[PDB]
Each structure stands twice: as C-alpha cells, then as structure tokens.
Amino acid sequence: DIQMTQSPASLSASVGETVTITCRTSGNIHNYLAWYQQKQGRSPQLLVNNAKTLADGVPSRFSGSGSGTQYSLKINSLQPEDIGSYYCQHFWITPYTFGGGTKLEIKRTVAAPSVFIFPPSDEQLKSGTASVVCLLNNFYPREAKVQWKVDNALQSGNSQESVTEQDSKDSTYSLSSTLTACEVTHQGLSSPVTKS
Amino acid sequence: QIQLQQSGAELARPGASVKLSCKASGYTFITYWIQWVKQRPGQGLEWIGAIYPGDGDTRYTQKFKAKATLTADKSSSTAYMQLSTLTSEDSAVYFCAKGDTYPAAMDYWGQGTSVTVSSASTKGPSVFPLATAALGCLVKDYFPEPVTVSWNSGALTSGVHTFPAVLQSSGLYSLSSVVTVICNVNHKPSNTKVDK
Amino acid sequence: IQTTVNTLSERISSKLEQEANASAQTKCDIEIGNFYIGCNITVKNMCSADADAQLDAVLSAATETYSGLTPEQKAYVPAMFTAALNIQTSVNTVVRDFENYVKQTCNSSAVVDNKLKIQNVIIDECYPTNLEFINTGSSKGNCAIKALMQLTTKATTQ
C-alpha cells in the first residue's frame, strides 16, 4: 500500500516569491502522480498530471518535477490567486491515496480593520431574538480581538465569531462577531477602535 | 464540455442509508472510469474508489469497502454511490470525478454533495437585513448546511464576504453575508429561496 | 540473432498453448490495433483469458531462451537492457532483473486496470528480420510481450 507524505502542511510567502511543496512515497510510483488545487469551498482542480505535465488553462508559474519516491510542485512567482490547499495523488497502483495537503497563505503588509456595527433589526426583535453584529473588513494579520461592551459592561459567553479565508484581491481577512459596543484590537491600529 | 452533475445537499439519518448520484455529460460515459473522493469538513481528501461504467468493474479502499457501494447506469450516464450505516464520520462532502481508461488522475470534477447525518430536523433560514459603507444579511437558525448567498442575483460580486457559518448552541446554524459600497439566500435542504 | 528471435516466438507460443492453454482460434479480449516501427512486423493472436498464467509462460519461454543462449550471445545481453529499459544487469542476474521489471510494470494500474479493448504497440528502431508480436489477450500478458520486443529490437542494432 502506497503512503504519501506531503510537506509542508502550511506555507506563508510574499507575492512573487517561489514556493515548493514536496510529496514523498513509500514506494517508487514511476511518475504516476497528480497535483490538485482546491480553492475555498470548490472542487479540486487538476494542476499537473503525470508528475511533470501541466494541465489545460494552468498558468506558467506552476511546475512539477520528480523521480521515483520524491515529487515536487513548485510555484515560481507566487500570486494571491494561488491561496488555497494543494494535494498530491498517486495512481501507480490501486488503491489510490492522496496527500495530507498544503495550505498556501500570503504574507503582506499590515492592514487595519474597518469596523462597522449593526443593530438587531426590528424583525428579529419581533421574534424574541436580538443579534448585534460587529464586522471587521479587510485586515491582514489575522490575529484580532473583538470585545463586547453593552451598557459599558464586558459581555462574556454570549458572542460568536467567524473569520473568512484570505481574499485573493487584497490578501486580507474579514471577521464577523454576533452578540445574542464592540472594542476592536489589532496590530494595525493604535488605540482599540470602538464603535457602538 | 464535460460536466459532472451531483445530487443536491442531503440530510441523512444516523445508522440509515443515502444514495448519491453523479450524472455525466459531454463524453462517452461508458469508456472512462468514475472516481469518488470524500472530504470531511476542514480535512483532506479521501479516495473512496472507482467504477468502470461499461464493465461495471469496481476498485475500493479497504476502509470504505463496507460503507460505500459503487454502481452505474449506462442508459442514464449516472454513477451512484451508496452509503450505509451512517455514522457522524460520514458527515462530509463527496465528489465524483472523471478518470481515464484506467482510473488515473481526476481531470474533471463534480461539484460535490454535502451530506450531514443527524437526528435533528430540517429548518429553513430566516434572512434578517443589516443597515464606502457596509450592509448585509443575517441568515439565522437553519439546518442542515449549507445555505448559499448571492447579492442582486449575482450582479454584486465585489466587496462581498459571506462568512463561515456558526453552530449556535441550539444546534441550528447562522451566518452573515455583507458587502461594502437585496440579497438572495438559497437553502436546498428546505427548498427555500428568500431574496430580501 | 534472428535465429534466437524465432526460438523465442516458438517457445512463447508453445509454453503459452501448454500452461495457459491458448490457441490461434481463442477469442481475444485485447486485440492489437496498429504496430509501428529493414524489419518485418507481424502480429500473432495466441489469446486466452487468464492473464497471470500468460505472464508466467512468457517468462519461462524467455528464461529457457536465455539459458539456451551461448556464452558469447549472453555477454551481449546486458547492453540491451540498458538500451531498452534503462536498467543495468549482468549475465548472472538478467533473469531475476527481467522478472522484477515485469512484475512491477505489468501490475501497474495503467496495465491491469486499463479497460481499453484495442491496444497499439509502437517501437522506435529495428534492423531482413521478421518480428512477431504474440497478442496474449491481456494487458498484463501483452505488457511482457512488449518488454521482450523492446529487448529484441535493440538487439538487432548490432
């Protein structure tokens, strides 16, 4: 049974840097190997086939190399559209197995959140529910803190939050927090912005 | 040209059974192997196995040899995967994908079926609105996943951030979608098409 | 040289009709489509339906033909492996090496899971030598026939 070690499981890099993902096999697989790219909540798409052959529509910065037990997907000139997970797959002999996956992310300059706040809409209030929403739009360092303070009281155990994946057009993140004032703490602002 | 259509989002019951359909179009469905891959949420790619629609021949990964039965109807150009004894680990996304005269790499991929196995009941979303400025939609209390959000029937793409849903403690799901500058929420598992 | 090639085709046809119980009138699952290359190419269907038995007979035919080879003829064989399979060997290990090559190659997903009915066989070089492709009827079986045909041709380059 062929086993597949793919390394690394995460990578960060700046636009234009070159990036390499390695797949390692327990046996020789004689270049019966595919690479796939998976963008967030989409189907895998074939990138490289038979170890070295690029697929149709795949840009020139993708390359594949490898011999018997060691195969590599290289991205010279890393682009923000390349954000996602990358998998290898051998087809040397049934059963077919995949790789663990590499999550590609982009290093960029620090970007401060834009903060907006939303009042529980009337319709929700009519239904005996009150959700208040805080949105941080497009910050780069993903590390963020939203603190909730209604009646200037630090609320706790009553908020739920959600981040997106890096935006390919900005390399930034977005964040949404629900309470059923917000104090935003991030390393691109000085004093924690507070909207209420 | 080549299109693989997959069955829509399903709610399965624990310990029962679900049947997934993969309709091929744009090629000779009888000369190319079909393959099935499973992805548990936030996890990597799992090779289930492959069927040869002509012969009807199958190959399987051992793990799934008890869980999944691959069949094909040549008359309809539909491949079928049958899942039995549904545990929670079968809550995942299942992909079909066209291979070659031998299974080989998966060059064209179906869109994927989200299967949630659960005792709970289907519930349609309530879409509450939210106020460059940020506006948005709150999609509260829905089960199972997933809900799709579009803005202006797909006109509005730039500035949109649909967030990963959150599991409110009730066991119902919630997500918000915002855009900076009427929203169309779809929930197939309850056949809901609200356009606030 | 060609005298050796004829022994091989004889021994393959005999060993096949015996252990694999095949005839020139047996139905072919896999049929050879086109053969591409002073050499004379012909295809002989000697088909059956049990791949593993076919592969075992081809190898005993090649083993016998090799062992029968004279000391001088043998010494020439190592060069053909490198030329035909990019694999090195020696007059005391050719046999075992040939059988690993085949076991590995002819049990690959592109051999054994290939549901293609018409198979084409193409070979680059050849030097009036008559060459016979024995269609065994299986991708596994024909896979080993193709391996021997590669060694035979790069043998006719001396």
Residue numbers in the entry:
A (entry chain E): 1 to 180, 193 to 208
B (entry chain F): 1 to 131, 141 to 190, 201 to 215
C (entry chain R): 7 to 43, 48 to 137, 143 to 173
The study reports:
Extensive research based on the VACV has identified several critical immunogens, including L1R (corresponding to MPXV M1R), D8L (corresponding to MPXV E8L), H3L (corresponding to MPXV H3L) and A27L (corresponding to MPXV A29L) in the IMV, as well as B5R (corresponding to MPXV B6R) and A33R (corresponding to MPXV A35R) in the EEV. Based on sequence conservation analysis, M1R is identical across the four MPXV clades and exhibits over 98% similarity with its orthologs in VACV, VARV and CPXV.
In addition, mMM1-10 and mMM1-16, especially mMM1-16, showed obvious binding to M1R-peptide-16 (V112-I128) in the peptide binding assays, whereas the other MAbs exhibited no binding to any of the 32 peptides. This suggests that mMM1-10 and mMM1-16 recognize the linear epitope (V112-I128), previously identified as a linear neutralization epitope on VACV L1R. Structural analysis revealed that mMM1-16 binds to the Q114-L126 region on M1R, consistent with the peptide binding result. W33 (H-CDR1), D55 (H-CDR2), T101 (H-CDR3), H30 (L-CDR1) and W92, T94 and Y96 (L-CDR3) form H-bonds with M1R. Additionally, mMM1-10 and mMM1-16, which bind to a linear neutralizing epitope, displayed partial inhibition at the tested antibody concentration range. For anti-M1R MAbs, we found that the conformational neutralizing epitope MAbs (mMM1-39 and mMM1-40) exhibited strong neutralizing activity, whereas the linear neutralizing epitope MAbs (mMM1-10 and mMM1-16) exhibited poor ability, consistent with previously reported 7D11 and VMC-3. In addition, the linear neutralizing epitope recognized by mMM1-16 is close to the conformational neutralizing epitope and may partially interfere with receptor binding, resulting in poor neutralization.
